[PDB]
Each structure stands twice: as structure tokens, then as C-alpha cells.
Amino acid sequence: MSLLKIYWRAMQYLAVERTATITMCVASVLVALVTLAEPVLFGRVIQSISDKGDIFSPLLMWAALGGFNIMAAVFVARGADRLAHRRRLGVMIDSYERLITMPLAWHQKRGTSNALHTLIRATDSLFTLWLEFMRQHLTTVVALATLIPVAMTMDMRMSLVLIVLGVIYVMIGQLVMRKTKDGQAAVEKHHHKLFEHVSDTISNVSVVQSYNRIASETQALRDYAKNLENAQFPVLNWWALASGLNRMASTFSMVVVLVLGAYFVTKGQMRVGDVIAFIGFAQLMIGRLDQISAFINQTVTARAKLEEFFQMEDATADRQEPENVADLNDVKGDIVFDNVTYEFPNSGQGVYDVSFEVKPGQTVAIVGPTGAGKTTLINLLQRVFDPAAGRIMIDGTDTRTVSRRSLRHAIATVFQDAGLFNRSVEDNIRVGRANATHEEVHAAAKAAAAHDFILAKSEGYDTFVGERGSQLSGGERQRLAIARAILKDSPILVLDEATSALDVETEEKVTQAVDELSHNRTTFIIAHRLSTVRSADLVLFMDKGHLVESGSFNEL
């Protein structure tokens, strides 16, 4: 019975615009009161024709209440829709902020692209929840609450039947939820499997289309759809049974109310006006119960997605030290490792017992066979995740006591996978300095030879590359990344696989240019080619996370 918890969370997210929310609630209670009082006035005026006199005023009051209901309906529709859109946008904003705030391991483990789909689905479901909940729930709940005393003061037999009617509705709701929850969980897990398979297949379309695996993959997805649709039937059957049972209850209560009114015809206190007002009350409750039953169904359907979204909301517990914490500045270059190892989750390997000191003014290149632990070493230095048990002494200062904002501000790491956005070359490069100049961009590009091939094609700089540079081949993304790194101008430059299958003349030119630019500071080289480290000062080779010699520039 987590429905109440879900509704509390929804109201917590919706309790931001205090003024707008309070005005909406006031409008809802007023319109509910008007809708309840309208049949009472209708009964008044129907009984009015039995006597004789100037009883035209009650009809005027009824017309005024009708016009007031119209105006209130307009205002509540407008305000509810506006509030729903504003709060949906705000929730999306804050959720996106936390989502991009998340660390790298959490994204690589689960997120990829499923996180975006979950965010969008949860956001739209919450939008629908906010709108329909607000309107229907406030109106019908206030109507029922104001109806209880009126039914208490009027004939109590009909109220006695009506409370049993409400008991019937809540009982069938409980019954359906009990018979439906397990099937809902199974359906959700099957749908997640299906969506994951679809996303994984679409994201790798070239591989699947280059191996004649279309038939096999579509048959597997057909199997997944079969598995999902196996568990879909019982829950909808139960929903149909619930709809039929409540329809039978509504018709049964209507017949009972009609018979009671017929008995009241023989003798009673009030008139056919009260009788028909009671009938109108009954039919209004029938309709609103139908809408809230449908609403309960939609809420049950979206339950699992809302639960997952709330879990990801509360999963943001990585405290960032809001208080002013010690930063670093004027990084001349002093890097010390002290017996720092890492063990992967549910795995092993990694680095083991690594320690070395870095003096300013000289560069260090790390070489060695693949899988040794060089990339994880680099992303440990930049601290994408915290080491197991060790001290990263930078400028004689631990990496744990340094704020994240200043940690990566004075660092310059090209990635092994040079990822790029789909924006223009200007936007994709001009990220190391938001206040830079086009002359600076040209100089940075010409230092990395990423301009000589772009001035002579594709509208010069203003070219929209595709996703991950899928529109200008792939031999340019490395040049663009190294140009961006040179533009960043940081004291510590990290060349992680910046030297790859390119022209040997291009490689030597890039190496000499970055040598001339980084002679003023200390920089890191992660490459297996022995021709890109002729100017290195303290080179070391690492195997399987264990150093062997870590000797001088010239070693055997």
C-alpha cells in the first residue's frame, strides 16, 4: 500500500508555488461547494412551483450559481494547466541537474540511455498525475465531505445505502490491487527487458546490419514481446471484472434509490424536487467514482515507473561539502602517489601498490601492454572515482581535501574515446574558455593542425558535425580534441591516446607542437608508440598494475 507514499511525494514536488497552489485549492473547494449546492437549489425551485408567490428569486440565484460555476471552471482549467506545465518544467530541470551531476561509474553501470527514457516517462506520468489528481480529486473529495452532513440532515436511509456504495468501491479497489500487484511487477520487468533490448540493438545498427542478423534479432524481440504479453491478460481481465462489478453496483443503487423515492411518494417530508436532487447527487457520485476509478487504474499502471524515478531521486546522496572547503591554486606541478590501489565492483585486476613522485618542469609518459591499468590510473588522477585506500598528494595536498570544482579546473585530459557534441566546430572547440577570441581559436587549431583541413572544406569553421563526429569521418575528432586541450591551457596536460593511426608526419608535427606548448609545465603521455616520447623526462612502464623498474629516461 505505497499509494499514499506516492501521493505524498507527488504533493511534495507540487508544493513549490505556495501562492498558486493555495489559490487552486481555494478555487477547487469553492467550485465543489457550488456543484453540490446547485442540485439543492434545483430542488428548492422545483418545490417552489407548488406554492404561489414571487419565488422567481431562487431561480435567479440558481442561474447566478451556474454562471459562477462556468467562471470557476474556466479559472481552474487555466490555472491547473499553467501550474502543471510550470512544475513539470521545474521538475525536469532539477532532475536533469542531478542526473548530469552523477559520477561516471553510476552512468556506465546503469544509465547509458535508459536514464533519459526513465526521466521522460516519469516526467510525463507526473504531469498527468498532477493535472487529473488536482482537478478530479479535489473536486470529488470536497464534494463528498460537504455531502456527508447534507445526507445526515436529510433522509438517512439513502445515506445508509450510499456509504455502503462507497465501501463497495473501496473494497473492489483493494481486491483489484491485491490481485494485480504481482502481475504489474512482472509486466514492468518484461517491459524493461524489451526496451533494453531495443535500445541496445538500435544503438549498434551498423554491426547488426553488417552481419545478416536482422531476422535473428527481430525474432528474439518477437520472443521478448511474447514473454511480455504472457502476463498482460490476467490484470486487464481483473480490471474488466472491476468495471463490470462497479457498473452493476451503480445500476443496483440507482434502482434502489428509485424504489425508495417511490416509497417516499406515498408519504414523506420534502417533495419531488428533493427526490430528483437526490437522484442527481447519486448520478454525480456515480460519474465521479467512475473517473476516480480510471485514475486509480492509470496510477497503478505508472506505479513502477514512478517508484524507479523516486529511487533515482533519493539515490542522490553524494555530498559535495556545501561549506567552503579547501581549494588549490597556482599548481606548479607536484604529483605524488602513495601506495594507491583500486578494486573494481564484483571484480579484481586494477592497480596494486603504485607510488611515485613528480617534480615540476618535466614530463612523465606511461607505457606498457594493454590492460595494464593506464586509463584507470589517469581517471584516478583526475578522480572520476575515489581510490580504495591511498593518498593522491598534489602540491603536497591530498585529493580528498580539494573541492571538485577546482580539481578539474586546472587539469587537461584528452579522453581515449574522444566524444563530441553535434554542435558546430566553434561551439565544440570553444569550451576551454567561454570568453576567448576567434584569433585564439585559430591559433589553437593551427597548433594542432586541425585548421588546415577545415579551412578548405565545409563552410570553414561553422560546420555541424553529427553525433560523435559521425559526419566528418573519425580522423578529425582526435585533432579537434587535442586542439581543444591546447585551448584549455592548463598546467597539467594529459595525452591519453592522443597519438593514434594518423600520418607519421602529422604525428611528429603534433608531438613537436605540444612539446613546444608544454615545455613550460608538466604533461602526461599515454601512448604505446615509442616515437612520441623522445622528449620525455621521467618515463615508466607498468604491467598489470605492478611497476617493474620505473627507471630513468634511458633504461634497459
Ligand X SMILES: Nc1ncnc2c1ncn2[C@@H]1O[C@H](COP(=O)(O)OP(=O)(O)O)[C@@H](O)[C@H]1O
Q: What residues form the annotated binding site?
A: 368-375
**Closest residue to ligand VO4: CB criterion:** 475
What residues from 444 to 463 belong to the interface with ligand VO4 (CB under 6 A)? none
| Residue window 43-82: x/- pattern of binding to a copy of itself, with contact defined by CB under 8 A | --------------------x--x--xxx-xx--xx--xx
**With binding defined as CB under 8 A, does residue 433 bind a copy of itself?**
no
Other C-beta atoms lying within 10 Å of the C-beta of residue 379: 17
Q: How far apart (Å, rounded) are the C-alpha atoms in residues 402 and 432? A: 21
The owner of cell 557534441 is 421
Q: How far apart (Å, rounded) are the C-alpha atoms in residues 342 and 520? A: 32
Q: Decide whether 360 or 371 has the Cβ nearer to ligand VO4.
A: 371
What residues from 386 to 415 belong to the interface with a copy of itself (CB under 8 A)? 405, 408-409, 411, 413, 415
**With binding defined as CB under 6 A, does residue 473 bind ligand VO4?**
yes
Q: Which of 206, 370, 435, 520 binds ligand X (CB under 6 A)?
A: 370
Q: What is the CA radius of gyration of the chain?
A: 35
Q: Which three cell numbers stand for residue 367?
A: 607505457
What residues from 409 to 448 belong to the interface with ligand VO4 (CB under 6 A)? 416
**Long-range Cβ contact pairs of 378-383 (< 8 A, separation 24 or more):** 378/413, 378/494, 378/496, 378/524, 378/526, 379/104, 380/340, 380/342, 380/351, 381/335, 381/494, 381/524, 382/407, 382/408, 382/411, 382/413, 382/494, 383/407
Residue type, 151: A
What residues from 97 to 126 belong to the interface with ligand X (CB under 6 A)? 108
Size of interface with a copy of itself, in residues (CB under 8 A): 127
Q: Decide whether 287 or 371 has the Cβ nearer to ligand VO4.
A: 371
Cross-strand pairs, 282: none
Q: Decide whether 112 or 500 has the Cβ nearer to ligand VO4.
A: 500
| Residue window 492-531: x/- pattern of binding to ligand VO4, with contact defined by CB under 6 A | -----x---x------------------------------
**With binding defined as CB under 6 A, does residue 354 bind ligand X?**
no
Q: Which three cell numbers stand for residue 105?
A: 561509474
DSSP letter, residue 267: S
Choose among a copy of itself, ligand X, ligand VO4, none what residue 550 binds, the Cβ cut-off being 5 to 8 Å by kind: none
**Distant-in-sequence, close-in-space partners of 129: CB < 8 Å, separation ≥ 6:** 10, 298, 299, 302, 306
Q: Which of 17, 155, 200, 395 binds a copy of itself (CB under 8 A)?
A: 200
Cα angle 450, 454, 455 (rounded to 5 degrees) comes to 115
Q: Decide whether 349 or 355 has the Cβ nearer to ligand X.
A: 349
CA distances from 306 to 10, 99, 119, 125, 386 (A): 10, 16, 10, 8, 31
To the nearest whole angstrom, how small is the minimum distance from the Cβ of residue 502 to ligand VO4?
A: 7
What residues from 173 to 192 belong to the interface with a copy of itself (CB under 8 A)? none
To the nearest whole angstrom, how small is the minimum distance from the Cβ of residue 528 to ligand X?
A: 9
**With binding defined as CB under 8 A, does residue 501 bind a copy of itself?**
yes
From 41-49, 253-261, 264-272, 472-480, span contacting ligand VO4 (CB under 6 A): 472-480
**With binding defined as CB under 8 A, does residue 315 bind a copy of itself?**
no
Q: Which of 67, 287, 460, 474 binds ligand VO4 (CB under 6 A)?
A: 474
Q: Decide whether 501 or 504 has the Cβ nearer to ligand VO4.
A: 501
Q: Give the CA count within 13 Å in the CB-facing half-sphere of 192.
A: 13
Q: Which three cell numbers stand for residue 511?
A: 608531438
Is residue 177 within 8 A of residue 300, CB to CB? The reply is yes
Is residue 40 within 8 A of residue 147, CB to CB? The reply is no
DSSP letter, residue 424: B
Q: How far apart (Å, rounded) are the C-alpha atoms in residues 451 and 275? A: 87
| Residue window 313-342: x/- pattern of binding to ligand VO4, with contact defined by CB under 6 A | ------------------------------
Nearest to 59 by CA among 69, 51, 68, 49: 49
**With binding defined as CB under 6 A, does residue 375 bind ligand VO4?**
yes
Size of interface with ligand X, in residues (CB under 6 A): 16
To the nearest whole angstrom, how small is the minimum distance from the Cβ of residue 100 to a copy of itself?
A: 6
Choose among ligand VO4, ligand X, a copy of itself, none what residue 166 binds, the Cβ cut-off being 5 to 8 Å by kind: none
Helices (H) and strands (E) in the chain — how many of each?
17, 10
To the nearest whole angstrom, how small is the minimum distance from the Cβ of residue 369 to ligand VO4?
A: 8
Q: Which three cell numbers stand for residue 200?
A: 541496445
Interacting residues toward ligand VO4 by CB under 6 A: 370-371, 374-375, 416, 473-475, 497, 501
Interacting residues toward ligand X by CB under 6 A: 108, 344, 347, 349-350, 370-376, 471-473, 475
